[PDB]
Structure 1
Amino acid sequence: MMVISEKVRKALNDQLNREIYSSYLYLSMATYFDAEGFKGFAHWMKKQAQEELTHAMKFYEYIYERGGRVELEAIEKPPSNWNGIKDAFEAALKHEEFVTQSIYNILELASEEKDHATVSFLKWFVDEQVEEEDQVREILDLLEKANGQMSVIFQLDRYLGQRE
Structure 2
Amino acid sequence: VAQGPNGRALAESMNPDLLSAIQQHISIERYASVTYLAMSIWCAERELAGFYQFFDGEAKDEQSHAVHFTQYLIARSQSNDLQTLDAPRQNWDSLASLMATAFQMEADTTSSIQSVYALAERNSDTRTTVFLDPLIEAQIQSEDQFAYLLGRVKFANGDPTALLVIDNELRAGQTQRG
Residue aligning to 1:118 = 128
Pairwise CA distance, 1:114: 0.6
* Alpha-carbon distance between aligned partners in 2 of 1:69 and 1:79, rounded to the nearest angstrom: 30
Report the identity percentage.
25
* Alpha-carbon distance between aligned partners in 1 of 2:154 and 2:160, rounded to the nearest angstrom: 13
Residue aligning to 1:80 = 90
**Residues 4 and 67 in structure 1, CA contact (< 8 A), matched pair in contact too:** no
1:27 corresponds to 2:37: yes
Instruction: Provide, for residues 84-132 of structure 1, a one-character-per-residue CA deviation record: whole Å limited to 9, x for no partner.
Output: 1111000011111111111111000001001000011111121111111
| 2:130 alignment partner AA | S
1:144 corresponds to 2:154: yes
* Alpha-carbon distance between aligned partners in 2 of 1:145 and 1:31, rounded to the nearest angstrom: 23
1:55 corresponds to 2:65: yes
Q: Could you list the runs of 5+ residues in structure 1 that have no partner in the other structure? A: none
TM-score, with length taken from structure 1: 0.95
Residue aligning to 2:9 = none
Between 1 and 2, higher relative CO (CA 8 Å, sep ≥ 6) is seen in 1
| 2:77 alignment partner AA | G
* TM-align CA RMSD: 1.3
Runs of 4+ in 1 over 4 A off after TM superposition: none
**Residues 107 and 119 in structure 1, CA contact (< 8 A), matched pair in contact too:** yes
Q: After alignment, is 50-59 or 2-11 more displaced? A: 2-11
* Higher share of residues assigned helix: 1
* Alpha-carbon distance between aligned partners in 1 of 2:84 and 2:73, rounded to the nearest angstrom: 19
Q: Could you list the runs of 5+ residues in structure 2 that have no partner in the other structure? A: 5-12
TM-score, with length taken from structure 2: 0.87
Count residues with an aligned counterpart. Answer: 164
Larger Rg: 2
